[PDB]
Amino acid sequence: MCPTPEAPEYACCLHGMPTFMHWHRVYLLHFEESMRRHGASVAVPYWD
């Protein structure tokens, strides 16, 4: 689903380009924003 539903005939995440980072930044944030909505007192941890 990408521009413009239901026309595509496409795939919707941004790889691989400079804005890759950017996109996924947003993505993670979205996730976080939903997670707290169900009572998350914790931000998404990172695994090293």
mmCIF file of all heavy atoms in Angstrom, unseen atoms left out:
data_model
loop_
_atom_site.group_PDB
_atom_site.id
_atom_site.type_symbol
_atom_site.label_atom_id
_atom_site.label_comp_id
_atom_site.label_asym_id
_atom_site.label_seq_id
_atom_site.Cartn_x
_atom_site.Cartn_y
_atom_site.Cartn_z
ATOM 1 N N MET A 1 0.863 -1.176 0.000
ATOM 2 C CA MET A 1 0.000 0.000 0.000
ATOM 3 C C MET A 1 0.901 1.228 0.000
ATOM 4 O O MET A 1 1.656 1.426 0.938
ATOM 5 C CB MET A 1 -0.948 0.016 1.216
ATOM 6 N N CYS A 2 0.850 2.034 -1.052
ATOM 7 C CA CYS A 2 1.661 3.247 -1.112
ATOM 8 C C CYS A 2 0.908 4.219 -2.043
ATOM 9 O O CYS A 2 -0.297 4.056 -2.182
ATOM 10 C CB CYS A 2 3.084 2.906 -1.558
ATOM 11 N N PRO A 3 1.558 5.242 -2.649
ATOM 12 C CA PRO A 3 0.655 6.033 -3.498
ATOM 13 C C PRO A 3 0.186 5.320 -4.761
ATOM 14 O O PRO A 3 1.024 4.823 -5.507
ATOM 15 C CB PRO A 3 1.505 7.249 -3.879
ATOM 16 N N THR A 4 -1.121 5.283 -5.005
ATOM 17 C CA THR A 4 -2.128 5.811 -4.089
ATOM 18 C C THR A 4 -3.201 4.748 -3.910
ATOM 19 O O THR A 4 -3.794 4.319 -4.898
ATOM 20 C CB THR A 4 -2.786 7.109 -4.614
ATOM 21 N N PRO A 5 -3.451 4.310 -2.662
ATOM 22 C CA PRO A 5 -4.368 3.179 -2.468
ATOM 23 C C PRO A 5 -5.715 3.428 -3.147
ATOM 24 O O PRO A 5 -6.282 4.511 -2.981
ATOM 25 C CB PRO A 5 -4.512 3.096 -0.942
ATOM 26 N N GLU A 6 -6.202 2.455 -3.913
ATOM 27 C CA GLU A 6 -5.567 1.144 -4.010
ATOM 28 C C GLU A 6 -4.742 0.921 -5.284
ATOM 29 O O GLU A 6 -4.338 -0.206 -5.568
ATOM 30 C CB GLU A 6 -6.636 0.054 -3.915
ATOM 31 N N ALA A 7 -4.476 1.991 -6.033
ATOM 32 C CA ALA A 7 -3.715 1.916 -7.293
ATOM 33 C C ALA A 7 -2.405 1.103 -7.249
ATOM 34 O O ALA A 7 -2.118 0.370 -8.195
ATOM 35 C CB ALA A 7 -3.414 3.325 -7.796
ATOM 36 N N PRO A 8 -1.596 1.232 -6.178
ATOM 37 C CA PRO A 8 -0.347 0.474 -6.227
ATOM 38 C C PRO A 8 -0.542 -1.016 -5.930
ATOM 39 O O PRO A 8 -1.349 -1.302 -5.047
ATOM 40 C CB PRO A 8 0.490 1.139 -5.144
ATOM 41 N N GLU A 9 0.150 -1.951 -6.595
ATOM 42 C CA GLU A 9 1.213 -1.762 -7.602
ATOM 43 C C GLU A 9 2.438 -1.009 -7.060
ATOM 44 O O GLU A 9 3.031 -0.195 -7.769
ATOM 45 C CB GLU A 9 0.674 -1.055 -8.856
ATOM 46 N N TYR A 10 2.822 -1.304 -5.816
ATOM 47 C CA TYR A 10 3.982 -0.671 -5.170
ATOM 48 C C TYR A 10 4.300 -1.335 -3.827
ATOM 49 O O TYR A 10 3.573 -2.223 -3.372
ATOM 50 C CB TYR A 10 3.726 0.823 -4.941
ATOM 51 N N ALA A 11 5.391 -0.893 -3.206
ATOM 52 C CA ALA A 11 5.736 -1.246 -1.828
ATOM 53 C C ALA A 11 6.201 0.038 -1.137
ATOM 54 O O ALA A 11 6.773 0.910 -1.781
ATOM 55 C CB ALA A 11 6.807 -2.323 -1.781
ATOM 56 N N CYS A 12 5.972 0.160 0.169
ATOM 57 C CA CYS A 12 5.860 1.496 0.767
ATOM 58 C C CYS A 12 6.942 2.021 1.713
ATOM 59 O O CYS A 12 6.922 3.195 2.061
ATOM 60 C CB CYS A 12 4.527 1.593 1.515
ATOM 61 N N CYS A 13 7.875 1.195 2.153
ATOM 62 C CA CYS A 13 8.924 1.748 2.999
ATOM 63 C C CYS A 13 10.109 2.228 2.147
ATOM 64 O O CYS A 13 10.291 1.778 1.013
ATOM 65 C CB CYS A 13 9.368 0.736 4.067
ATOM 66 N N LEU A 14 10.892 3.155 2.700
ATOM 67 C CA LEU A 14 11.969 3.810 1.962
ATOM 68 C C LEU A 14 13.329 3.121 2.156
ATOM 69 O O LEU A 14 14.001 3.328 3.165
ATOM 70 C CB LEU A 14 12.061 5.295 2.360
ATOM 71 N N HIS A 15 13.704 2.292 1.177
ATOM 72 C CA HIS A 15 15.026 1.676 1.086
ATOM 73 C C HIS A 15 15.394 1.651 -0.396
ATOM 74 O O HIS A 15 14.505 1.527 -1.241
ATOM 75 C CB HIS A 15 15.055 0.244 1.645
ATOM 76 N N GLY A 16 16.672 1.803 -0.736
ATOM 77 C CA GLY A 16 17.714 2.212 0.181
ATOM 78 C C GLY A 16 18.262 3.525 -0.335
ATOM 79 O O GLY A 16 18.717 3.610 -1.477
ATOM 80 N N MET A 17 18.206 4.551 0.506
ATOM 81 C CA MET A 17 18.490 5.916 0.091
ATOM 82 C C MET A 17 18.926 6.728 1.307
ATOM 83 O O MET A 17 18.889 6.212 2.419
ATOM 84 C CB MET A 17 17.249 6.520 -0.576
ATOM 85 N N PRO A 18 19.369 7.987 1.110
ATOM 86 C CA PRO A 18 19.746 8.771 2.294
ATOM 87 C C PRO A 18 18.638 8.875 3.347
ATOM 88 O O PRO A 18 18.931 8.780 4.542
ATOM 89 C CB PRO A 18 20.072 10.143 1.704
ATOM 90 N N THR A 19 17.394 9.039 2.905
ATOM 91 C CA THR A 19 16.267 9.252 3.810
ATOM 92 C C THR A 19 15.798 7.988 4.538
ATOM 93 O O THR A 19 14.900 8.055 5.385
ATOM 94 C CB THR A 19 15.071 9.848 3.051
ATOM 95 N N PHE A 20 16.403 6.850 4.197
ATOM 96 C CA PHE A 20 16.189 5.566 4.882
ATOM 97 C C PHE A 20 16.036 5.773 6.389
ATOM 98 O O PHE A 20 14.931 5.637 6.936
ATOM 99 C CB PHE A 20 17.355 4.618 4.562
ATOM 100 N N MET A 21 17.147 6.140 7.026
ATOM 101 C CA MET A 21 17.183 6.597 8.416
ATOM 102 C C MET A 21 15.917 7.352 8.783
ATOM 103 O O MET A 21 15.103 6.867 9.578
ATOM 104 C CB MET A 21 18.390 7.510 8.654
ATOM 105 N N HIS A 22 15.755 8.521 8.164
ATOM 106 C CA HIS A 22 14.629 9.407 8.424
ATOM 107 C C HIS A 22 13.341 8.614 8.539
ATOM 108 O O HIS A 22 12.711 8.624 9.595
ATOM 109 C CB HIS A 22 14.502 10.464 7.324
ATOM 110 N N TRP A 23 13.001 7.877 7.482
ATOM 111 C CA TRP A 23 11.743 7.143 7.439
ATOM 112 C C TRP A 23 11.585 6.301 8.684
ATOM 113 O O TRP A 23 10.611 6.429 9.436
ATOM 114 C CB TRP A 23 11.663 6.242 6.206
ATOM 115 N N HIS A 24 12.584 5.463 8.914
ATOM 116 C CA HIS A 24 12.496 4.487 9.972
ATOM 117 C C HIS A 24 12.506 5.182 11.328
ATOM 118 O O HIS A 24 11.856 4.704 12.259
ATOM 119 C CB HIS A 24 13.614 3.459 9.826
ATOM 120 N N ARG A 25 13.171 6.338 11.423
ATOM 121 C CA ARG A 25 13.076 7.125 12.646
ATOM 122 C C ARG A 25 11.601 7.320 12.942
ATOM 123 O O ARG A 25 11.112 6.854 13.983
ATOM 124 C CB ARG A 25 13.790 8.478 12.544
ATOM 125 N N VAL A 26 10.893 7.943 11.993
ATOM 126 C CA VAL A 26 9.460 8.177 12.143
ATOM 127 C C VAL A 26 8.795 6.891 12.573
ATOM 128 O O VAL A 26 8.051 6.861 13.552
ATOM 129 C CB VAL A 26 8.776 8.651 10.851
ATOM 130 N N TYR A 27 9.114 5.823 11.849
ATOM 131 C CA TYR A 27 8.463 4.544 12.052
ATOM 132 C C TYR A 27 8.563 4.155 13.516
ATOM 133 O O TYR A 27 7.542 3.911 14.173
ATOM 134 C CB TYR A 27 9.091 3.484 11.157
ATOM 135 N N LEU A 28 9.786 4.169 14.042
ATOM 136 C CA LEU A 28 10.009 3.759 15.419
ATOM 137 C C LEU A 28 9.168 4.619 16.343
ATOM 138 O O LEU A 28 8.477 4.109 17.231
ATOM 139 C CB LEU A 28 11.484 3.862 15.785
ATOM 140 N N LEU A 29 9.201 5.925 16.097
ATOM 141 C CA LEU A 29 8.438 6.859 16.903
ATOM 142 C C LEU A 29 6.967 6.468 16.897
ATOM 143 O O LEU A 29 6.351 6.373 17.965
ATOM 144 C CB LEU A 29 8.618 8.289 16.402
ATOM 145 N N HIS A 30 6.422 6.198 15.704
ATOM 146 C CA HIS A 30 5.017 5.797 15.592
ATOM 147 C C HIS A 30 4.776 4.654 16.553
ATOM 148 O O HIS A 30 3.867 4.706 17.394
ATOM 149 C CB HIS A 30 4.654 5.371 14.164
ATOM 150 N N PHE A 31 5.647 3.650 16.450
ATOM 151 C CA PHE A 31 5.550 2.461 17.287
ATOM 152 C C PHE A 31 5.451 2.879 18.742
ATOM 153 O O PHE A 31 4.486 2.528 19.431
ATOM 154 C CB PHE A 31 6.753 1.544 17.062
ATOM 155 N N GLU A 32 6.427 3.674 19.178
ATOM 156 C CA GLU A 32 6.484 4.145 20.556
ATOM 157 C C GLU A 32 5.181 4.801 20.958
ATOM 158 O O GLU A 32 4.621 4.499 22.018
ATOM 159 C CB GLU A 32 7.635 5.129 20.740
ATOM 160 N N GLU A 33 4.686 5.665 20.081
ATOM 161 C CA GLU A 33 3.482 6.428 20.362
ATOM 162 C C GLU A 33 2.284 5.518 20.577
ATOM 163 O O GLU A 33 1.414 5.816 21.391
ATOM 164 C CB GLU A 33 3.211 7.418 19.229
ATOM 165 N N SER A 34 2.248 4.402 19.859
ATOM 166 C CA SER A 34 1.180 3.436 20.062
ATOM 167 C C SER A 34 1.420 2.640 21.342
ATOM 168 O O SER A 34 0.484 2.337 22.078
ATOM 169 C CB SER A 34 1.058 2.491 18.864
ATOM 170 N N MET A 35 2.679 2.315 21.615
ATOM 171 C CA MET A 35 2.990 1.437 22.737
ATOM 172 C C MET A 35 2.581 2.067 24.063
ATOM 173 O O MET A 35 1.923 1.429 24.887
ATOM 174 C CB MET A 35 4.477 1.090 22.744
ATOM 175 N N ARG A 36 2.957 3.327 24.247
ATOM 176 C CA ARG A 36 2.556 4.094 25.422
ATOM 177 C C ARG A 36 1.047 4.157 25.556
ATOM 178 O O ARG A 36 0.515 4.231 26.665
ATOM 179 C CB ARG A 36 3.132 5.507 25.367
ATOM 180 N N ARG A 37 0.360 4.119 24.418
ATOM 181 C CA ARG A 37 -1.100 4.177 24.401
ATOM 182 C C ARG A 37 -1.709 2.981 25.134
ATOM 183 O O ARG A 37 -2.850 3.035 25.582
ATOM 184 C CB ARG A 37 -1.610 4.256 22.954
ATOM 185 N N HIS A 38 -0.937 1.907 25.277
ATOM 186 C CA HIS A 38 -1.405 0.743 26.039
ATOM 187 C C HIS A 38 -0.660 0.621 27.363
ATOM 188 O O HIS A 38 -0.536 -0.466 27.925
ATOM 189 C CB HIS A 38 -1.261 -0.545 25.222
ATOM 190 N N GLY A 39 -0.158 1.748 27.858
ATOM 191 C CA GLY A 39 0.447 1.795 29.175
ATOM 192 C C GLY A 39 1.932 1.488 29.235
ATOM 193 O O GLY A 39 2.406 0.925 30.220
ATOM 194 N N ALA A 40 2.673 1.857 28.194
ATOM 195 C CA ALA A 40 4.121 1.705 28.238
ATOM 196 C C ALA A 40 4.747 2.838 29.045
ATOM 197 O O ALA A 40 4.564 4.015 28.725
ATOM 198 C CB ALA A 40 4.708 1.661 26.835
ATOM 199 N N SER A 41 5.467 2.479 30.104
ATOM 200 C CA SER A 41 6.243 3.452 30.864
ATOM 201 C C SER A 41 7.687 3.384 30.395
ATOM 202 O O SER A 41 8.575 4.005 30.973
ATOM 203 C CB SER A 41 6.158 3.179 32.363
ATOM 204 N N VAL A 42 7.908 2.606 29.341
ATOM 205 C CA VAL A 42 9.247 2.344 28.838
ATOM 206 C C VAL A 42 9.340 2.593 27.335
ATOM 207 O O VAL A 42 8.515 2.107 26.565
ATOM 208 C CB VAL A 42 9.676 0.888 29.133
ATOM 209 N N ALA A 43 10.353 3.350 26.924
ATOM 210 C CA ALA A 43 10.630 3.568 25.511
ATOM 211 C C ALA A 43 11.327 2.345 24.931
ATOM 212 O O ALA A 43 11.990 1.608 25.657
ATOM 213 C CB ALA A 43 11.485 4.809 25.321
ATOM 214 N N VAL A 44 11.173 2.136 23.628
ATOM 215 C CA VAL A 44 11.727 0.965 22.955
ATOM 216 C C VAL A 44 13.234 0.850 23.166
ATOM 217 O O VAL A 44 13.995 1.703 22.715
ATOM 218 C CB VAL A 44 11.426 0.994 21.438
ATOM 219 N N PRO A 45 13.659 -0.209 23.876
ATOM 220 C CA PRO A 45 15.076 -0.449 24.183
ATOM 221 C C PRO A 45 15.893 -0.753 22.935
ATOM 222 O O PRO A 45 15.320 -1.168 21.927
ATOM 223 C CB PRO A 45 15.044 -1.678 25.106
ATOM 224 N N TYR A 46 17.206 -0.552 23.000
ATOM 225 C CA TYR A 46 18.076 -0.941 21.897
ATOM 226 C C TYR A 46 18.909 -2.157 22.285
ATOM 227 O O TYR A 46 19.287 -2.322 23.443
ATOM 228 C CB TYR A 46 18.979 0.224 21.471
ATOM 229 N N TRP A 47 19.185 -3.004 21.300
ATOM 230 C CA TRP A 47 19.975 -4.215 21.493
ATOM 231 C C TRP A 47 21.304 -4.065 20.759
ATOM 232 O O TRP A 47 21.347 -3.867 19.547
ATOM 233 C CB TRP A 47 19.175 -5.441 21.024
ATOM 234 N N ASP A 48 22.390 -4.120 21.520
ATOM 235 C CA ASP A 48 23.716 -3.839 20.999
ATOM 236 C C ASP A 48 24.381 -5.121 20.495
ATOM 237 O O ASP A 48 24.818 -5.960 21.283
ATOM 238 C CB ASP A 48 24.555 -3.160 22.086
#
